[PDB]
Amino acid sequence: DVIYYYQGQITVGNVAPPMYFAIQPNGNAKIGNNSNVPSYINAQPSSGGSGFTAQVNITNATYNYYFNFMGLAVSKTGYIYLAKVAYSYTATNNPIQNATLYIMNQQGQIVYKYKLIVNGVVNSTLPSTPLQINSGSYIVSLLIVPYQGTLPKTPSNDLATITVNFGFSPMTASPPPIPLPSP
Amino acid sequence: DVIYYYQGQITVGNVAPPMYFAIQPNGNAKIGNNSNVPSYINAQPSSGGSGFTAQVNITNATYNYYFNFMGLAVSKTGYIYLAKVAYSYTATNNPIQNATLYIMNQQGQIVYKYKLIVNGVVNSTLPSTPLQINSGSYIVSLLIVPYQGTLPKTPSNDLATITVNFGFSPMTASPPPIPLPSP
Amino acid sequence: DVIYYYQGQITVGNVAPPMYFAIQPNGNAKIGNNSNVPSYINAQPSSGGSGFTAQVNITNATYNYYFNFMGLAVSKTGYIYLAKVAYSYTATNNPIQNATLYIMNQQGQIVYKYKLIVNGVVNSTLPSTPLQINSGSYIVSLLIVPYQGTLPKTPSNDLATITVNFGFSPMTASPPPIPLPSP
Amino acid sequence: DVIYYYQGQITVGNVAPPMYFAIQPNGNAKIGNNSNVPSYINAQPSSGGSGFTAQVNITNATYNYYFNFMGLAVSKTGYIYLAKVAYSYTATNNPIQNATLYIMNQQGQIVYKYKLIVNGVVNSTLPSTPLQINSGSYIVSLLIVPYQGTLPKTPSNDLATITVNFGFSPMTASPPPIPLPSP
Amino acid sequence: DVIYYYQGQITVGNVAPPMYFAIQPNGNAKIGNNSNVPSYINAQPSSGGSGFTAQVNITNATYNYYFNFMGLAVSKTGYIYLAKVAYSYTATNNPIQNATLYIMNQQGQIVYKYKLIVNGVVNSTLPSTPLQINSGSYIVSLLIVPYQGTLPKTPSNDLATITVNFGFSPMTASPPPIPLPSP
Ligand SMILES: *[C@@H]1O[C@H](CO)[C@@H](O[C@@H]2O[C@H](CO[C@H]3O[C@H](CO)[C@@H](O)[C@H](O)[C@@H]3O)[C@@H](O[C@H]3O[C@H](CO)[C@@H](O)[C@H](O)[C@@H]3O)[C@H](O[C@@H]3O[C@H](CS(=O)(=O)O)[C@@H](O[C@@H]4O[C@H](CO)[C@@H](O)[C@H](O)[C@H]4O)[C@H](O)[C@H]3O)[C@H]2NC(C)=O)[C@H](O)[C@H]1NC(C)=O
Ligand SMILES: *[C@@H]1O[C@H](CO)[C@@H](O[C@@H]2O[C@H](CO[C@H]3O[C@H](CO)[C@@H](O)[C@H](O)[C@@H]3O)[C@@H](O[C@H]3O[C@H](CO)[C@@H](O)[C@H](O)[C@@H]3O)[C@H](O[C@@H]3O[C@H](CS(=O)(=O)O)[C@@H](O[C@@H]4O[C@H](CO)[C@@H](O)[C@H](O)[C@H]4O)[C@H](O)[C@H]3O)[C@H]2NC(C)=O)[C@H](O)[C@H]1NC(C)=O
Ligand SMILES: *[C@@H]1O[C@H](CO)[C@@H](O[C@@H]2O[C@H](CO[C@H]3O[C@H](CO)[C@@H](O)[C@H](O)[C@@H]3O)[C@@H](O[C@H]3O[C@H](CO)[C@@H](O)[C@H](O)[C@@H]3O)[C@H](O[C@@H]3O[C@H](CS(=O)(=O)O)[C@@H](O[C@@H]4O[C@H](CO)[C@@H](O)[C@H](O)[C@H]4O)[C@H](O)[C@H]3O)[C@H]2NC(C)=O)[C@H](O)[C@H]1NC(C)=O
Ligand SMILES: *[C@@H]1O[C@H](CO)[C@@H](O[C@@H]2O[C@H](CO[C@H]3O[C@H](CO)[C@@H](O)[C@H](O)[C@@H]3O)[C@@H](O[C@H]3O[C@H](CO)[C@@H](O)[C@H](O)[C@@H]3O)[C@H](O[C@@H]3O[C@H](CS(=O)(=O)O)[C@@H](O[C@@H]4O[C@H](CO)[C@@H](O)[C@H](O)[C@H]4O)[C@H](O)[C@H]3O)[C@H]2NC(C)=O)[C@H](O)[C@H]1NC(C)=O
Ligand SMILES: *[C@@H]1O[C@H](CO)[C@@H](O[C@@H]2O[C@H](CO[C@H]3O[C@H](CO)[C@@H](O)[C@H](O)[C@@H]3O)[C@@H](O[C@H]3O[C@H](CO)[C@@H](O)[C@H](O)[C@@H]3O)[C@H](O[C@@H]3O[C@H](CS(=O)(=O)O)[C@@H](O[C@@H]4O[C@H](CO)[C@@H](O)[C@H](O)[C@H]4O)[C@H](O)[C@H]3O)[C@H]2NC(C)=O)[C@H](O)[C@H]1NC(C)=O
Ligand SMILES: *[C@@H]1O[C@H](CO)[C@@H](O[C@@H]2O[C@H](CO[C@H]3O[C@H](CO)[C@@H](O)[C@H](O)[C@@H]3O)[C@@H](O[C@H]3O[C@H](CO)[C@@H](O)[C@H](O)[C@@H]3O)[C@H](O[C@@H]3O[C@H](CS(=O)(=O)O)[C@@H](O[C@@H]4O[C@H](CO)[C@@H](O)[C@H](O)[C@H]4O)[C@H](O)[C@H]3O)[C@H]2NC(C)=O)[C@H](O)[C@H]1NC(C)=O
Ligand SMILES: *[C@@H]1O[C@H](CO)[C@@H](O[C@@H]2O[C@H](CO[C@H]3O[C@H](CO)[C@@H](O)[C@H](O)[C@@H]3O)[C@@H](O[C@H]3O[C@H](CO)[C@@H](O)[C@H](O)[C@@H]3O)[C@H](O[C@@H]3O[C@H](CS(=O)(=O)O)[C@@H](O[C@@H]4O[C@H](CO)[C@@H](O)[C@H](O)[C@H]4O)[C@H](O)[C@H]3O)[C@H]2NC(C)=O)[C@H](O)[C@H]1NC(C)=O
Ligand SMILES: *[C@H]1O[C@H](CO)[C@@H](O)[C@H](O)[C@@H]1O
Ligand SMILES: *[C@H]1O[C@H](CO)[C@@H](O)[C@H](O)[C@@H]1O
Ligand SMILES: *[C@H]1O[C@H](CO)[C@@H](O)[C@H](O)[C@@H]1O
Ligand SMILES: *[C@H]1O[C@H](CO)[C@@H](O)[C@H](O)[C@@H]1O
Ligand SMILES: *[C@H]1O[C@H](CO)[C@@H](O)[C@H](O)[C@@H]1O
């Protein structure tokens, strides 16, 4: 048998993140200041600012809104998009009608709106178009619209889970909407 | 292209509502007992107490008053405000001059007054200041002042519609007046 | 911050009035026929029958009586009461000792007597008890007792003003005496 | 509960009286000149000419006559009637058989005769028919016929009291005989 | 002593490569166009297309993805496999959790997935099964999943190195998975 071998050599270095999740980034007391309300939300930046984790309590309210629960810091200009969403629930009936995640200016204006879940199903059109985002820092906020009547009378900690991936690229020109592979 | 992906994970739990709309909450026969007068008003709490729906018949009377048409139960202390109002009418002429919604003590004293419509237009100053409301239960009542001469001689079911959103926050300290986003 | 939003939706329809003020209601030439005596009284039903407006000239007579100045039509049985009275005067001295407003049967019998002003002050006991009134039509008449010596020698158009609100409810069972709020 | 409120607004002005009681009206030295005879009669116009008050001493005479004790001035033509009479006495026996009040022309002719009391009782047919009276001024006179034997030997100031109400209307056409209500 | 000598004679010729690494192979502007993003990746084909060299900057992002950083051209059909992987790092803590290298169709579909590093260690099952690959050209892309918290705050050029050997055989029938010897 004849085998030809081709050698790839990859050297790995380390660079400061183009964007990261944080509480009060750069000491800005207006960005990400509602990470923790002692029976209703508990959110934290994932290790090294790599993402975020949130425990979120919905109720009977027709809109449940988690304003400024995280801060998004962007160190260098680039293009951002919603790359992937995954949704699952433990209940007999689907608990969420609509879930939307907002990136917002410090003055509370919406910069970008990301529909995660629509009429009870994940956004089907993903990955979304890469849109430019400027350097600075942004309020990030979550809105949930439950399906009324489906929420149990007895409280619970594990009604549903939403996993979301944002893709960011630090390029000068817009990339295609690249979908995130399985590792 | 280089894409960096950041993962948000949101776990959703369920909590008993800080406030809810109800008829005779906790069996209190004095709160919300006028939800239904068989040709003049028909009001109901929206599913799970998430809000309310009312069909309301105005007449030629210079003030039309719907006393105790709903009950508001508040399970834990918090801050309440008028977040958003929307108003529209099907007639050629605007039917309503003033519409005001009252939260009232069990003794019929006004706790808070919410002007929904003033001189024929929605309240422009919204969202209103968050004000503290104590735990307990409250009478809620609607006053409408028509524009006389505009109401048709023949009855109708769809003269106008008023949509109102109350924001409530279960925090110890007052929030900013956060406006409700579009989903 | 966590905000829970609760949505009220009010749909407004239109219904023929349970009672209204009119001149010669249903063409009845005996009800409300003294709305206009060309130097002494000029009364009219407010727009759509929503109430009434009267210009009323008092004189030196010890009783000044305005018989049948308005007609009250009641289309459906219900409970009526005097909800609120407001009184003010432009003169140096209080011009009115007693003012009383009567609802009367077609045969001139008194059905209900409403004391608006007593010994120069508004009725303090208001709102009055809701009393049943049958469908049909009623003479309405005003009696004023001036304070003699207080009326100026020179005539005037704006000596005093009396504002009165009647509450009517089309319910089968008597309501509490609900006071009219400020809008 | 549903309450409909109807607003009456009454604005009160002031007008020179269509008729009034006076002593020597317009300076006419023939009208009302016997208001005061120093042990037998003392009569005065009530404040602003609104009526009259008289202290009247009867004696053993079979007719007691108080000629021209008041003057009646009529500024504009209208219809006059005896609206109400009330009579009471402090004695054991009824002191008066007949009491009659006359409106008289300046020449002493009777224009109208008002029987107040007949055979010891008030006129039962009241209110009387409205009759036209012309502008000008009139003598007014009282006749009393006692029941002899009933008057005490010792004089007294409070044997009996007669209260009389005249209705006047300044209309061109005759009204019905409207009875004066209780305030 | 008796020595028997056996003569091997090897004549060496030269043949166009069955596959090679390239930027935009055959002028195809869609294959290998992300070899260079000026602070995040710098990749080049090794001399004569014999392999590739890449400098790759990871950050705090939970997935770091280097899409289309090289082009793989395959001139004749054959069988390809991952022959050998070697991994080392200069840091105190292991920087990489998972590293995966993808061969992809021009439409961005995954043809083959090569797990280089899994849970911080090199793939232990190597050499992998030879799988057929058709003639044409392929996108090649690298995904790295760091261990968060391990990456230093100060940037560096030499955090880790990954050396990878792909074996290719131009035979019609699949060979055994032959491991690459040390020279
Ligand atoms: C946590 O981070 C939050 C980020 O949202 C902060 O919320 C912001 O609070 C401001 C005032 O907060 C004070 O009062 C609250 C109680 O109400 C306390 O909880 C706080 O501790 C603090 O004491 C609020 O500002 C409003 O009030 C100001 C006076 O105090 C007044 O100057 C402002 O104009 C507001 O009325 C923020 O609200 C936003 O303010 C911006 C202007 S600025 O950024 O404040 O300068 C407004 O933008 C204007 O909007 C118009 C459009 O209508 C634009 O044309 C114009 O260009 C732009 O300036 C927003 O409309 C207004 O909503 C409020 N932030 C948001 C996004 O609502 C909170 O304070 C932080 N808490 C702590 C403890 O750090
Ligand atoms: C439905 O829910 C309604 C809630 O408003 C109830 O209305 C309340 O009705 C009370 C009596 O109702 C009875 O009579 C009506 C007919 O009139 C029937 O329809 C009912 O079925 C029932 O049979 C009424 O109380 C009044 O009457 C009482 C005697 O019966 C008397 O003790 C009260 O004082 C009242 O005069 C409610 O009216 C309010 O009462 C409170 C006191 S309390 O809450 O009743 O104890 C008053 O507050 C006082 O006010 C002063 C200020 O002036 C304060 O300083 C003082 O602290 C405070 O106590 C209110 O002024 C007075 O209006 C009446 N509720 C309201 C808000 O008006 C209705 O009953 C319910 N119907 C059914 C069938 O459940
Ligand atoms: C405007 O509306 C007014 C409403 O009050 C009308 O007033 C009513 O006028 C009747 C007659 O009017 C005629 O004469 C006047 C001049 O006097 C003109 O201005 C009118 O244009 C018209 O030409 C008057 O009726 C009286 O006269 C009748 C004969 O003409 C006689 O049959 C009546 O009995 C009266 O004497 C109204 O007076 C009331 O009448 C009722 C009976 S009914 O309703 O007329 O049938 C009486 O009720 C009786 O009373 C006893 C108690 O004592 C009860 O037991 C019994 O059950 C009941 O029948 C009233 O006592 C009596 O006062 C008079 N209405 C009132 C309330 O006084 C006016 O006509 C209208 N004008 C126009 C132009 O339309
Ligand atoms: C403010 O204005 C109110 C009306 O607008 C006045 O209310 C009236 O109160 C009368 C007694 O008021 C006294 O007592 C209260 C304490 O309760 C005090 O606050 C007052 O200062 C005052 O001292 C009340 O009258 C009742 O008692 C009378 C004996 O004194 C008696 O003659 C009456 O019959 C009553 O029982 C009034 O109650 C209603 O009266 C009407 C008739 S009318 O309006 O008075 O002419 C009745 O209607 C009758 O009902 C029967 C059936 O039962 C029918 O067949 C009939 O055809 C019909 O006439 C009601 O039944 C009766 O409830 C009351 N009036 C009203 C209309 O509510 C109040 O006093 C004023 N306040 C002040 C400070 O001046
Ligand atoms: C107070 O007001 C009283 C109103 O009645 C005045 O009474 C009227 O007094 C006249 C004369 O008074 C003089 O004399 C008395 C003593 O007797 C004094 O007290 C007075 O101060 C005063 O000095 C009196 O007139 C009579 O006398 C006249 C001559 O002095 C003579 O001209 C008259 O004709 C009388 O005889 C009034 O009597 C009435 O007079 C009218 C006419 S007029 O109005 O005087 O012009 C007569 O009417 C005529 O009658 C016929 C019918 O028979 C008709 O057809 C004809 O058209 C009509 O003219 C009356 O019949 C006659 O009674 C007398 N008034 C009355 C009503 O009797 C009194 O003077 C005043 N006092 C003061 C101080 O001011
Ligand atoms: C209560 O008091 C009332 C007056 O305050 C009395 O009314 C008067 O009734 C007289 C007749 O009464 C009899 O009939 C009724 C039934 O209808 C019964 O209830 C009574 O008990 C009694 O039996 C009436 O008189 C009329 O008839 C007379 C004949 O008997 C005749 O002489 C009169 O002329 C009348 O036709 C009264 O009617 C008015 O009278 C005045 C004059 S006066 O007041 O009587 O002196 C007339 O004025 C005249 O009018 C003309 C123009 O037409 C002028 O030119 C002239 O200058 C002027 O004098 C009226 O025209 C006439 O209508 C009547 N009086 C009044 C003032 O209304 C009642 O009887 C007393 N009730 C009791 C129980 O005692
Ligand atoms: C560098 O090389 C890259 C190789 O990946 C190129 O990426 C490809 O870009 C296409 C469009 O690029 C244009 O827009 C971007 C900004 O977004 C600029 O950077 C570029 O310069 C350029 O201007 C992109 O195509 C998409 O957009 C097209 C419209 O412009 C549209 O026709 C396509 O359908 C895409 O939506 C490529 O994305 C892939 O396209 C293929 C089809 S095709 O190969 O384009 O014809 C899709 O395959 C389809 O997928 C379904 C499964 O869902 C299959 O059933 C079906 O058979 C198949 O056709 C892919 O799903 C879609 O992702 C994009 N390539 C990839 C792999 O994503 C880049 O352009 C090159 N840049 C330069 C400057 O040369
Ligand atoms: C940003 O600049 C890069 C070069 O670094 C280009 O590749 C891109 O097209 C954009 O101009
Ligand atoms: C209520 O308490 C919370 C902590 O749960 C504070 O954030 C707030 O300022 C108020 O004191
Ligand atoms: C009239 O009827 C209504 C029902 O429409 C009841 O609520 C009331 O008690 C009265 O009987
Ligand atoms: C007097 O005139 C009035 C109009 O002012 C009429 O109502 C009445 O009938 C009489 O003719
Ligand atoms: C491809 O063809 C070769 C001959 O060149 C065989 O050895 C092999 O088995 C496959 O058929």
Side-chain angles (χ1 to χ4, degrees):
Chain A
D1 306 5
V2 181
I3 320 295
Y4 296 113
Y5 301 94
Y6 304 77
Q7 190 169 277
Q9 181 171 337
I10 301 149
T11 60
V12 176
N14 161 59
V15 151
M19 59 159 261
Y20 54 95
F21 292 87
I23 293 175
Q24 302 179 13
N26 309 318
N28 191 345
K30 296 193 173 182
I31 303 297
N33 63 359
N34 225 6
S35 304
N36 176 20
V37 182
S39 201
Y40 300 99
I41 185 162
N42 174 20
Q44 282 187 345
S46 188
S47 186
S50 59
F52 66 88
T53 302
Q55 175 28 242
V56 170
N57 270 329
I58 61 172
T59 70
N60 289 31
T62 192
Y63 308 89
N64 297 234
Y65 190 48
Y66 306 90
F67 176 75
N68 205 17
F69 78 89
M70 264 293 110
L72 167 59
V74 179
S75 67
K76 190 190 178 177
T77 68
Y79 298 82
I80 186 168
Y81 61 102
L82 182 63
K84 183 180 288 182
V85 172
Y87 170 56
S88 62
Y89 55 88
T90 62
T92 298
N93 300 289
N94 189 347
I96 294 174
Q97 181 179 346
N98 281 343
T100 301
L101 185 48
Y102 303 79
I103 299 177
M104 301 169 76
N105 199 9
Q106 188 180 139
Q107 288 75 20
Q109 297 157 335
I110 297 160
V111 176
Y112 299 123
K113 177 199 288 178
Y114 298 101
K115 297 184 171 185
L116 308 178
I117 298 170
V118 179
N119 296 98
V121 295
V122 299
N123 185 317
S124 60
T125 209
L126 292 174
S128 77
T129 304
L131 298 172
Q132 187 176 243
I133 189 166
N134 297 302
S135 58
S137 58
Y138 301 91
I139 291 178
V140 41
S141 300
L142 174 71
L143 184 76
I144 301 177
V145 175
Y147 277 114
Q148 264 65 33
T150 70
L151 306 182
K153 190 177 187 179
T154 302
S156 64
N157 189 35
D158 185 2
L159 193 80
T161 178
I162 310 169
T163 302
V164 49
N165 287 275
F166 287 97
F168 181 101
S169 60
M171 301 187 73
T172 33
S174 182
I178 308 303
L180 167 65
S182 58
Chain B
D1 308 3
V2 181
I3 320 295
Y4 295 113
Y5 300 95
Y6 304 78
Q7 189 167 277
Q9 181 170 336
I10 301 149
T11 60
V12 176
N14 160 59
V15 151
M19 59 159 261
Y20 54 95
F21 292 86
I23 293 175
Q24 302 179 14
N26 309 318
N28 191 344
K30 296 193 173 181
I31 303 297
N33 63 359
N34 225 6
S35 304
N36 176 21
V37 182
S39 201
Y40 300 99
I41 185 162
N42 174 20
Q44 282 189 343
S46 188
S47 186
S50 59
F52 66 88
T53 302
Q55 175 28 242
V56 170
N57 270 329
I58 61 172
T59 70
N60 289 31
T62 191
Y63 308 90
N64 297 234
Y65 190 48
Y66 306 90
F67 176 75
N68 205 17
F69 78 89
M70 263 293 110
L72 167 59
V74 179
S75 67
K76 190 191 178 179
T77 68
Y79 298 82
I80 186 168
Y81 61 102
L82 182 63
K84 183 181 288 181
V85 172
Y87 170 56
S88 62
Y89 55 88
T90 62
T92 298
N93 300 289
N94 188 347
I96 294 174
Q97 181 179 346
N98 280 344
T100 301
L101 185 48
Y102 303 79
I103 299 177
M104 301 169 76
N105 199 9
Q106 188 180 139
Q107 288 75 20
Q109 297 157 335
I110 297 160
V111 176
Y112 299 123
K113 177 199 288 176
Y114 298 101
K115 297 184 172 183
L116 308 178
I117 298 170
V118 180
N119 296 98
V121 295
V122 299
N123 185 317
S124 60
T125 209
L126 292 174
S128 77
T129 304
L131 298 172
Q132 187 176 243
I133 190 165
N134 297 302
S135 58
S137 58
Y138 301 91
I139 291 178
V140 41
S141 300
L142 174 71
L143 184 76
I144 301 176
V145 175
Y147 277 114
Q148 264 65 33
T150 70
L151 306 181
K153 190 178 185 181
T154 302
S156 64
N157 189 35
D158 185 2
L159 193 80
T161 178
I162 309 169
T163 303
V164 49
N165 287 275
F166 287 97
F168 181 101
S169 60
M171 302 190 72
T172 33
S174 182
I178 308 304
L180 167 65
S182 58
Chain C
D1 308 4
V2 181
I3 320 295
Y4 295 114
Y5 300 95
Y6 303 78
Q7 189 167 277
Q9 181 170 336
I10 301 149
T11 60
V12 176
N14 160 59
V15 151
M19 59 159 261
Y20 54 95
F21 292 86
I23 293 175
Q24 302 179 14
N26 309 318
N28 191 344
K30 296 194 174 179
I31 303 297
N33 63 359
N34 225 6
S35 304
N36 176 20
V37 182
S39 201
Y40 300 99
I41 185 163
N42 174 20
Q44 282 186 345
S46 188
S47 186
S50 59
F52 66 88
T53 302
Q55 175 28 242
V56 170
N57 270 329
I58 61 172
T59 70
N60 290 31
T62 192
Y63 308 89
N64 297 234
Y65 190 48
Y66 306 90
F67 176 75
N68 205 17
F69 78 89
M70 263 293 110
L72 167 59
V74 179
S75 67
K76 190 188 185 177
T77 68
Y79 298 82
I80 186 168
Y81 61 102
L82 182 63
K84 182 181 288 182
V85 172
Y87 170 56
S88 62
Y89 55 88
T90 62
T92 298
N93 300 289
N94 189 347
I96 294 174
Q97 181 179 346
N98 280 344
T100 301
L101 185 48
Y102 303 79
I103 299 178
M104 301 169 76
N105 199 10
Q106 189 180 139
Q107 288 75 20
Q109 297 157 336
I110 297 160
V111 176
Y112 299 123
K113 177 199 288 174
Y114 298 101
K115 297 184 172 184
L116 308 178
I117 298 170
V118 179
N119 296 98
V121 295
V122 299
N123 185 317
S124 60
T125 209
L126 292 174
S128 77
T129 304
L131 298 172
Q132 187 176 243
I133 190 166
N134 297 302
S135 58
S137 58
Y138 301 91
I139 291 178
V140 41
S141 300
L142 174 71
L143 184 76
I144 301 176
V145 175
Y147 277 114
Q148 264 65 33
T150 70
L151 306 181
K153 190 178 184 180
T154 302
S156 64
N157 189 35
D158 185 2
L159 193 80
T161 178
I162 309 169
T163 302
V164 49
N165 287 275
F166 287 97
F168 181 101
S169 60
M171 301 190 72
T172 33
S174 182
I178 308 303
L180 167 65
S182 58
Chain D
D1 308 3
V2 181
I3 320 295
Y4 295 114
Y5 300 95
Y6 303 78
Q7 189 168 277
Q9 181 171 336
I10 301 149
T11 60
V12 176
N14 160 59
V15 151
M19 59 159 261
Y20 54 95
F21 292 86
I23 293 175
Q24 302 179 13
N26 309 318
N28 191 345
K30 296 193 174 181
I31 303 297
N33 63 359
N34 225 6
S35 304
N36 176 20
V37 182
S39 201
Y40 301 99
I41 185 163
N42 174 20
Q44 282 185 347
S46 188
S47 186
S50 59
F52 66 88
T53 302
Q55 175 28 241
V56 170
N57 269 329
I58 61 171
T59 70
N60 289 32
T62 192
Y63 308 89
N64 297 234
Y65 190 48
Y66 306 90
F67 176 75
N68 205 17
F69 78 89
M70 264 293 110
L72 167 59
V74 179
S75 67
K76 190 188 185 179
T77 68
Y79 298 82
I80 186 168
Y81 60 102
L82 182 63
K84 183 180 288 183
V85 172
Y87 170 56
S88 61
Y89 55 88
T90 62
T92 298
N93 300 289
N94 189 347
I96 294 174
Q97 181 179 346
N98 280 344
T100 301
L101 185 48
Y102 303 79
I103 299 178
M104 301 169 76
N105 199 9
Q106 189 180 139
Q107 288 75 20
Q109 297 157 336
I110 297 160
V111 176
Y112 299 123
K113 177 199 288 172
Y114 298 101
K115 298 183 174 185
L116 308 179
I117 298 170
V118 179
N119 296 98
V121 295
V122 299
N123 185 317
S124 60
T125 209
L126 292 174
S128 77
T129 304
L131 298 172
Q132 187 176 243
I133 190 166
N134 297 302
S135 58
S137 58
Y138 301 91
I139 291 178
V140 41
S141 300
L142 174 71
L143 184 76
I144 301 176
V145 175
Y147 277 114
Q148 264 64 34
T150 70
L151 306 181
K153 189 173 184 178
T154 302
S156 64
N157 189 35
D158 185 2
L159 194 80
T161 178
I162 309 169
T163 303
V164 49
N165 287 275
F166 287 97
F168 181 101
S169 60
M171 301 191 72
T172 33
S174 182
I178 308 304
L180 167 65
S182 58
Chain E
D1 307 4
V2 181
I3 320 296
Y4 296 113
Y5 301 94
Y6 305 77
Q7 189 170 277
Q9 181 174 337
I10 300 149
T11 60
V12 176
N14 161 59
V15 151
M19 59 159 261
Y20 54 95
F21 292 86
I23 293 175
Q24 302 179 13
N26 309 318
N28 191 344
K30 296 193 174 181
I31 303 297
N33 63 359
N34 225 6
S35 304
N36 176 20
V37 182
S39 201
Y40 301 99
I41 185 163
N42 174 20
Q44 282 187 346
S46 188
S47 186
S50 59
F52 66 88
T53 302
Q55 175 28 242
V56 170
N57 270 328
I58 61 172
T59 70
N60 290 30
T62 192
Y63 308 89
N64 297 234
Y65 190 48
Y66 306 90
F67 176 75
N68 205 17
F69 78 89
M70 263 293 110
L72 167 59
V74 179
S75 67
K76 190 179 180 179
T77 68
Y79 298 82
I80 186 168
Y81 61 102
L82 182 63
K84 183 180 288 182
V85 172
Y87 170 56
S88 61
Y89 55 88
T90 62
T92 298
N93 300 289
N94 189 347
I96 294 174
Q97 181 179 346
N98 281 344
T100 301
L101 185 48
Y102 303 79
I103 299 178
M104 301 169 76
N105 199 9
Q106 189 180 139
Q107 288 75 20
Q109 297 157 336
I110 297 160
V111 176
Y112 299 123
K113 177 199 288 179
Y114 298 101
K115 298 184 173 185
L116 309 179
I117 298 170
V118 179
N119 296 98
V121 295
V122 299
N123 185 317
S124 60
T125 209
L126 292 174
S128 77
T129 304
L131 298 172
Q132 187 176 243
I133 189 166
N134 297 302
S135 58
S137 58
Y138 301 91
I139 291 178
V140 41
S141 300
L142 174 71
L143 184 76
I144 301 176
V145 175
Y147 277 114
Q148 264 65 34
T150 70
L151 306 181
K153 189 178 186 176
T154 302
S156 64
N157 189 35
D158 185 2
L159 194 80
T161 178
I162 310 169
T163 303
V164 48
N165 287 275
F166 287 97
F168 181 101
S169 60
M171 302 185 74
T172 33
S174 182
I178 308 303
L180 167 65
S182 58

